[PDB]
Scaffold this active site. Structure first.
Site, PDB file in Angstrom:
ATOM      1  N   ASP A 193       0.830  -1.192   0.000  1.00 33.06           N
ATOM      2  CA  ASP A 193       0.000   0.000   0.000  1.00 33.06           C
ATOM      3  C   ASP A 193       0.867   1.244   0.000  1.00 33.06           C
ATOM      4  O   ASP A 193       2.101   1.141   0.019  1.00 33.06           O
ATOM      5  CB  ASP A 193      -0.908  -0.009   1.226  1.00 33.06           C
ATOM      6  N   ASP A 195       1.122   4.844   2.279  1.00 35.87           N
ATOM      7  CA  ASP A 195       0.673   5.471   3.492  1.00 35.87           C
ATOM      8  C   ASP A 195       0.978   6.940   3.406  1.00 35.87           C
ATOM      9  O   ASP A 195       2.087   7.330   3.022  1.00 35.87           O
ATOM     10  CB  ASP A 195       1.402   4.856   4.672  1.00 35.87           C
ATOM     11  N   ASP A 253      -3.519   4.277   2.611  1.00 42.62           N
ATOM     12  CA  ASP A 253      -3.950   4.698   3.954  1.00 42.62           C
ATOM     13  C   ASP A 253      -3.758   6.200   4.050  1.00 42.62           C
ATOM     14  O   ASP A 253      -2.644   6.686   3.880  1.00 42.62           O
ATOM     15  CB  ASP A 253      -3.122   4.034   5.038  1.00 42.62           C
TER      16      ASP A 253
HETATM   17  N1  LIG Z   1      -0.584   3.806  15.003  1.00 43.07           N
HETATM   18  C1  LIG Z   1      -0.938   2.990  13.985  1.00 43.07           C
HETATM   19  N2  LIG Z   1       0.050   2.576  13.149  1.00 43.07           N
HETATM   20  C2  LIG Z   1      -0.239   1.754  12.112  1.00 43.07           C
HETATM   21  C3  LIG Z   1      -1.632   1.301  11.879  1.00 43.07           C
HETATM   22  N3  LIG Z   1      -1.629   0.512  10.792  1.00 43.07           N
HETATM   23  C4  LIG Z   1      -0.349   0.494  10.402  1.00 43.07           C
HETATM   24  O1  LIG Z   1       0.018  -0.185   9.381  1.00 43.07           O
HETATM   25  N4  LIG Z   1       0.498   1.219  11.152  1.00 43.07           N
HETATM   26  C5  LIG Z   1       1.957   1.431  11.067  1.00 43.07           C
HETATM   27  C6  LIG Z   1       2.652   0.130  11.407  1.00 43.07           C
HETATM   28  C7  LIG Z   1       3.977   0.308  10.726  1.00 43.07           C
HETATM   29  O2  LIG Z   1       4.865   0.881  11.677  1.00 43.07           O
HETATM   30  C8  LIG Z   1       3.699   1.268   9.571  1.00 43.07           C
HETATM   31  C9  LIG Z   1       3.724   0.582   8.214  1.00 43.07           C
HETATM   32  O3  LIG Z   1       2.426   0.122   7.861  1.00 43.07           O
HETATM   33  P1  LIG Z   1       2.074  -0.839   6.624  1.00 43.07           P
HETATM   34  O4  LIG Z   1       1.119  -1.879   7.165  1.00 43.07           O
HETATM   35  O5  LIG Z   1       1.578  -0.026   5.448  1.00 43.07           O
HETATM   36  O6  LIG Z   1       3.480  -1.576   6.295  1.00 43.07           O
HETATM   37  P2  LIG Z   1       4.719  -0.900   5.494  1.00 43.07           P
HETATM   38  O7  LIG Z   1       4.246   0.389   4.845  1.00 43.07           O
HETATM   39  O8  LIG Z   1       5.879  -0.854   6.456  1.00 43.07           O
HETATM   40  O9  LIG Z   1       5.110  -1.972   4.379  1.00 43.07           O
HETATM   41  P3  LIG Z   1       4.270  -2.356   3.073  1.00 43.07           P
HETATM   42  O10 LIG Z   1       3.878  -3.789   3.361  1.00 43.07           O
HETATM   43  O11 LIG Z   1       3.087  -1.432   2.945  1.00 43.07           O
HETATM   44  O12 LIG Z   1       5.264  -2.200   1.971  1.00 43.07           O
HETATM   45  O13 LIG Z   1       2.404   1.841   9.781  1.00 43.07           O
HETATM   46  C10 LIG Z   1      -2.644   1.799  12.838  1.00 43.07           C
HETATM   47  O14 LIG Z   1      -3.841   1.462  12.704  1.00 43.07           O
HETATM   48  N5  LIG Z   1      -2.236   2.612  13.838  1.00 43.07           N
HETATM   49 MN   LIG Z   2       2.570   0.620   3.718  1.00 49.01          MN
HETATM   50 MN   LIG Z   3      -0.630   1.026   5.382  1.00 50.41          MN
END
Ligand SMILES: Nc1nc2c([nH]c(=O)n2[C@H]2C[C@H](O)[C@@H](COP(=O)(O)OP(=O)(O)OP(=O)(O)O)O2)c(=O)[nH]1
Ligand SMILES: [Mn+2]
Ligand SMILES: [Mn+2]
Length: 329
Positions: A193, A195, A253
């Site tokens: 995804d 973010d 996100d």
């Molecule tokens: N505080 C908070 N942090 C979150 C939530 N969901 C979520 O993914 N994160 C944080 C956790 C990780 O430290 C960071 C990365 O999220 P991600 O699931 O998109 O994983 P990523 O970007 O590292 O890797 P990718 O698989 O997307 O390439 O975002 C949430 O609901 N609350």
């Molecule tokens: Mn991500």
């Molecule tokens: Mn994400």
């Protein structure tokens, strides 16, 4: 090598991908069986290997490294001696792991739901679609777009999505900023995804920004799904990304943070998941402070740390600053 992943740099590209992959398969499987300690242990061990300067070609290189118990060592030994680990290949070949992987990777499906479904005899995506009563709308959206959502998101997708998200937030609120977070901020070339962390320099101006941004994105045909969660104002979306001729669904996100919380939100959302977990455990155990994505609370004093930057948070925790590309734990 320091004990906590947040005390050491973990670059994007490292020398032991095969080995850590194998330990992460075991962490993941342990996670799928609700075995949290084992997950963490396998995950910590995997990130140790990612932090090593050299490829591990002899087991003699594994001797005397932290969090690295007999089980993880044995896995590495079998991989070094025979080019494969039987426990890893068993998990990799097991219908249970394969199915859980299949289900948990669907948008909006966590382990609990995947397991439930497994236990009720569901195995394939087509099984889930034969039982739409069992799916939330999020999960239905995840299933409708599963192929696209299993396609790695590329940097060029990120740039295009950042542009439309920037346009929509600039149009919705002048001065409002969009910060790429998650794995792409850490240097990854691909992801599951994109973010984005959205804020405004004036505290309070971000109020009701997300729906304004959403309406604009929606008005341009860019939104396939979104679910407003109102914790930060956030929406976990599926965008319709246009491409030459085609289009593809992409998970985005959008998180809105007030500017006072922005450093914490950036730190939290930048990850990696393990890095953040490690940073929060460090803060708790080593410094007696509770770190989350909203702040750094002192539970004794009942106080919140004011940060202007991620650097401030690190500094306040007694840690050397690690830029995002070295947080790939
Ligand atoms: N505080 C908070 N942090 C979150 C939530 N969901 C979520 O993914 N994160 C944080 C956790 C990780 O430290 C960071 C990365 O999220 P991600 O699931 O998109 O994983 P990523 O970007 O590292 O890797 P990718 O698989 O997307 O390439 O975002 C949430 O609901 N609350
Ligand atoms: Mn991500
Ligand atoms: Mn994400």
């Amino acid at each position: 090598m320091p004990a906590y992943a947040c005390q050491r740099p973990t670059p994007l590209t490292h020398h032991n991908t095969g080995l850590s992959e194998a330990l992460e398969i075991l962490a993941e499987a342990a996670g799928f069986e609700g075995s949290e300690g084992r997950l963490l242990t396998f995950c910590r061990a995997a990130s140790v290997l990612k932090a090593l300067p050299s490829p591990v070609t002899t087991l003699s290189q594994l001797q005397g490294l932290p969090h690295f118990g007999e089980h993880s060592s044995r896995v590495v030994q079998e991989l070094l001696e025979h080019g494969v680990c039987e426990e890893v290949e068993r998990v990799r070949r097991s219908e249970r792991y394969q199915t859980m992987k299949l289900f948990t990777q669907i948008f909006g499906v966590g382990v609990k739901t995947a397991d439930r479904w497994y236990r009720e005899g569901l195995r394939t995506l087509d099984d889930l679609r034969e039982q739409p009563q069992k799916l939330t709308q999020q999960q239905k959206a995840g299933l409708q777009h599963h192929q696209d959502l299993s396609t790695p998101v590329l940097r060029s997708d990120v740039d295009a999505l950042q542009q439309v998200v920037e346009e929509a937030v600039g149009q919705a609120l002048p001065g409002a900023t969009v910060t790429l977070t998650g794995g792409f901020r850490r240097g990854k070339l691909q992801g599951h995804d994109v973010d984005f962390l959205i804020t405004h320099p004036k505290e309070g101006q971000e109020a009701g920004l997300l729906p304004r941004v959403m309406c604009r994105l929606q008005d341009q045909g860019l939104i396939l799904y979104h679910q407003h969660q109102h914790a930060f104002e956030r929406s976990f979306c599926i965008f319709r990304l246009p491409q030459p001729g085609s289009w593809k669904a992409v998970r985005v996100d959008l998180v809105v943070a007030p500017v006072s919380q922005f450093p914490f939100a950036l730190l939290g959302w930048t990850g990696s998941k393990l890095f953040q977990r490690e940073l929060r455990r460090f803060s708790r155990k080593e410094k007696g402070l509770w770190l989350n994505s909203h702040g750094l609370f002192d539970p004794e004093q009942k106080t919140f740390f004011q940060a202007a930057s991620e650097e401030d948070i690190f500094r306040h925790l007694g840690l050397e600053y690690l830029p995002p590309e070295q947080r790939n734990a």
